[PDB]
Amino acid sequence: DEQGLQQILQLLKESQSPDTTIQRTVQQKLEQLNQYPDFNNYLIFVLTKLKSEDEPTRSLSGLILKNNVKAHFQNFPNGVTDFIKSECLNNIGDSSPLIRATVGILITTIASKGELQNWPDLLPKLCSLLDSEDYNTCEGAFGALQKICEDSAEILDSDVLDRPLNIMIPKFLQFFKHSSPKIRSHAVACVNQFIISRTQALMLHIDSFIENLFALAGDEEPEVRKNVCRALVMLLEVRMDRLLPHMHNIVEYMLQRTQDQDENVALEACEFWLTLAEQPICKDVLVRHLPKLIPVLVNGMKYSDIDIILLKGDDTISDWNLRKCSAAALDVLANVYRDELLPHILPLLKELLFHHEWVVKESGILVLGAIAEGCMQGMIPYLPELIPHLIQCLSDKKALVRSITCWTLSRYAHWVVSQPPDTYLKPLMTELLKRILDSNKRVQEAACSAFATLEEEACTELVPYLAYILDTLVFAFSKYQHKNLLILYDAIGTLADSVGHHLNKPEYIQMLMPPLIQKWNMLKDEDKDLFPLLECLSSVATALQSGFLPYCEPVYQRCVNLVQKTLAQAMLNNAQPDQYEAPDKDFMIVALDLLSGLAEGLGGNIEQLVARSNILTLMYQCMQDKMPEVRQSSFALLGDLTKACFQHVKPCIADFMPILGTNLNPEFISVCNNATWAIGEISIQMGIEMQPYIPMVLHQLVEIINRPNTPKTLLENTAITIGRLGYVCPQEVAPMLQQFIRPWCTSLRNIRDNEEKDSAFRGICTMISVNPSGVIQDFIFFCDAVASWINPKDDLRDMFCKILHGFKNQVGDENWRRFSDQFPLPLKERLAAFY
Amino acid sequence: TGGKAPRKQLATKAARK
């Protein structure tokens, strides 16, 4: 503390040297000295007790200390920590603003990484320094308390410390009228941290808080209005009831603060419209202010002069701007007012899309895109004019105009594909393919994403141009960076999903596969760049089907290795977590999905590969995995392999079914769906041998059917599975026919007459023959299910007729008359004519 | 129809949908 103190001071002066090499070499020393027990004893000493040396040196040591708290604080001796905690609280409100801010950031850091409860008398001291007549001590404590409330937004406790916000919050509200704007801004910032959290200490002061907010509403300092605006936005959700009286006064206030001097204030005031547009009373209040708000929102969607510099041209900007916030606000408002928003948009929109200034024109196109979803039914008449114009905007000289044009066109893709292909679709697809190979990297991703969107709405409408589409996409595999390669992977994979088996042509495979095999061979099993590639190949393998035969073996082998290694590393981590790290299961999930692609694509051709491999054992380990997505992907592989090669899956049914029966829990939808679908596919292959496995599966399935909410995809899948289960073993399914048939019929009556609908109904008829007692009570639903059929197969029709006539003979021609009269006309007439 | 649930969307597909 005297013979080694100058040894550190010289390192502080040397660390401030303008030489780059000298800096990093000394910074390393302060890490090699950090491993000493009382090295941090010096850093805090220089900051507070060494008031002889210059300020930037004293500050630097305190900031080196701070970095020695954000790291290596787990090894911080309690004796030394007690020293720093005491010295900082002492020098709160130091004369030098540089030293004070250095001290303040130490307190907020120690209380952040190190926990708050480990510093007991932190809040009681800071909250008692707010009354100090020394302004610096007041600001220093208040500036720290703000960062504490931000870092510790929780620790509201309500029974952990003392609920310190019972004294702090009422004290905070008193500082809303303090002289200094810097103090007022602090006071409002602290309270705002406990608005959404429904703080009981603040909610019983909600009247004093709002009244104090109205006073600070017209403050000069923008940092005050910034916080006041944020507070009102938050109060719009949690305590809407206390704003209705002063509602229109606030809306006007927010409407001016949206056009505020400080853009920072303008953003927070703009979030008010997003919040308000999600409230039930929105469509009642804003109607008055609509003609005055709409142009303000649109005008804010223009590119600022700063953005046009960051975005070169005449992802380098923030995630949230005034532009994106106004775009979002206009998006949501469009879905609230629907077509009633058009009279406020269409006039100014007409004078925006054909404007000569590119900035003003670009913002106009964005407006057209934002209101697409909501005002769709009102924009359709204006589309035959706008759509051909936007396709021309794809050829604009400006880059930012071309990119936004791709996106706006993609939001009307549903209408374009509904129209004749050769008027909109063909020129749009052509011009969009041109922007994929654009010179500007930003326009590329915009078009490649827009094209991927176009492919989903068009599907088989792109089959004629499938050679034109592929030539552009494949060529794009040579001039694309790693950022846009992801979008390309999506566009290619989406194409295969859209055109389906139409992609299975020799000339297509000849150009589409070699670039994919290129990336395949250049990546190692640890590179996370495999995730987008194999997801793409999963769609391609499913589409190419048998055309994927010459590529199956090297793909199949590597996928098994990925799953096997991921599971092996998982076992190692489970045994010794300290020596072996946990593996990324995304490698396993992705590899399993590609295996499903092969099984679904090749079918029986994968039989030789499923055998001579341990994929069955690996799947058995994947189904037990903690991660639901892993279980989701493995169950999907089980079903696809059930159809492909059941002769290899059959010896493992005994241990598969109990796991399948366990994962019939609707908490994880996708897991429950794939499990249910797997059971159904297994039932077909088993036959009457499915008998012992039914009781541990059926009870869940019936529960899922009668279960409220739930997606239709799970209801349909559960009905088909039960139907397939009833077809193979009627004895163990028929007695419970009485209690699932009501939602069973309503679920399958809206499905087209396909194979899945056939096998399900073929089962409901089999367990109606056995125990017909269950269909009698709710026979109204079975009729509507049968009358939904247009062209059922002959044997299934005979089954329907034999059941309907059977019921008709049970009740008589007179009872059947009165019973059939409650049917709608087309349903009543169909049953009479068909059966 | 029913079948299996769609695969997990990645960064790109989720960004547009």
Tab-separated table of C-alpha atoms in Angstrom, chain A residues 456 486 490 494 535 538-539 600 640 673-674 716-717, chain B residues 1-8 10 12-13 16-17:
chain	number	residue	atom	x	y	z
A	456	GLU	CA	-47.037	-20.017	-51.199
A	486	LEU	CA	-30.824	-17.847	-45.579
A	490	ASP	CA	-36.350	-20.330	-47.758
A	494	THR	CA	-40.818	-22.998	-50.292
A	535	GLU	CA	-34.332	-27.642	-43.663
A	538	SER	CA	-36.027	-31.601	-46.242
A	539	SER	CA	-38.471	-29.833	-48.555
A	600	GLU	CA	-41.927	-39.360	-46.944
A	640	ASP	CA	-43.403	-41.781	-41.950
A	673	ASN	CA	-50.550	-34.159	-33.000
A	674	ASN	CA	-47.617	-36.154	-34.374
A	716	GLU	CA	-59.179	-33.950	-37.348
A	717	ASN	CA	-56.097	-36.050	-36.613
B	1	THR	CA	-56.497	-34.511	-44.379
B	2	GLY	CA	-54.399	-34.438	-41.214
B	3	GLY	CA	-50.817	-35.668	-41.247
B	4	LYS	CA	-47.906	-34.363	-39.195
B	5	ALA	CA	-47.362	-30.851	-37.845
B	6	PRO	CA	-45.185	-28.508	-39.960
B	7	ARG	CA	-41.487	-28.174	-39.112
B	8	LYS	CA	-40.105	-25.383	-36.931
B	10	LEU	CA	-36.348	-20.541	-38.999
B	12	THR	CA	-36.330	-16.174	-42.577
B	13	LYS	CA	-39.742	-17.851	-42.810
B	16	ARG	CA	-42.103	-12.726	-43.327
B	17	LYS	CA	-44.967	-14.747	-41.834
